[PDB]
Structure formats: C-alpha cells, structure tokens
Amino acid sequence: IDHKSKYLREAALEANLSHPETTPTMLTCPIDSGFLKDPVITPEGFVYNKSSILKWLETKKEDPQSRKPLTAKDLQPFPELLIIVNRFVETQTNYEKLKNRLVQNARVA
C-alpha cells in the first residue's frame, strides 16, 4: 500500500474542507497536538514528527496509536507532506490578517 500517496490526498482534502482558521488533524502531531515540522511515516501509514516519535521509542518500542511493534528504522522521511503543511499555515496567517482588518474597519465605519 502506498501510504504516502494515501496520506497526502487525504490530508489535502481535509485541509481544503477545513476553514483557514481551523487546524486539520492530519497536519498535526498525533502525540503532541502541534503542526508537523519534520514528518516521518510508518509502515502502518501513521505520521509523526521525527523528534517526537523517537522520544517515544526510547521508552517503548511500539506505535503510540496501534501499540504494534515499531523501531526507528521503520521511520521513513516524509518531506512531501511539508508542502501541504506550509501552504495551510501561510494561508492561515494571511487570512487571520484579512479577517482582523475587515472586523476592525467595520467597528468604526
């Protein structure tokens, strides 16, 4: 199963269905709830930040979500996802600037 392609198309759809201010789950880190900075993908198709999943593997050598056997070698770099992440974050910031300007202008108009 091409987990990279499946994750990309699913995360992209969720991003487009999500309001610019909303934070898409598939663009976040499962165990720390923050935006993905350096995403890696597992053979199961799960995606974490590199530093976060590695810190987890120090204590327990299993996936945090499925509790199935997992090692650092199973972690494949997923830089392509950063394209989707970066575009949403930049769009979110630009929309928050627009929204604030429109609201403020309407207060005094």
The secondary structure of 4-68 as a DSSP string is: HHHHHHHHHHHHHHS-TTS--GGGB-TTT-SB-SSEEE-TTS-EEEHHHHHHHHHH-SB-TTT--
Q: Are strands 39-41 and 47-49 parallel, antiparallel or unpaired?
A: antiparallel
- B/e letters for 20-30, b = 16+ CB within 10 Å, e = fewer, are eeeebebbbbb
Q: Which residue has the tokens 């005094």?
A: 108
Among 34, 69, 39, 66, CA closest to 53:
39
Token pair of 106 as six digits = 């309407």
Q: Does domain 1-109 have CATH number 3.40.50.720?
A: no
Q: Are strands 47-49 and 76-77 parallel, antiparallel or unpaired?
A: unpaired
- The three-state secondary structure class of 69 is strand
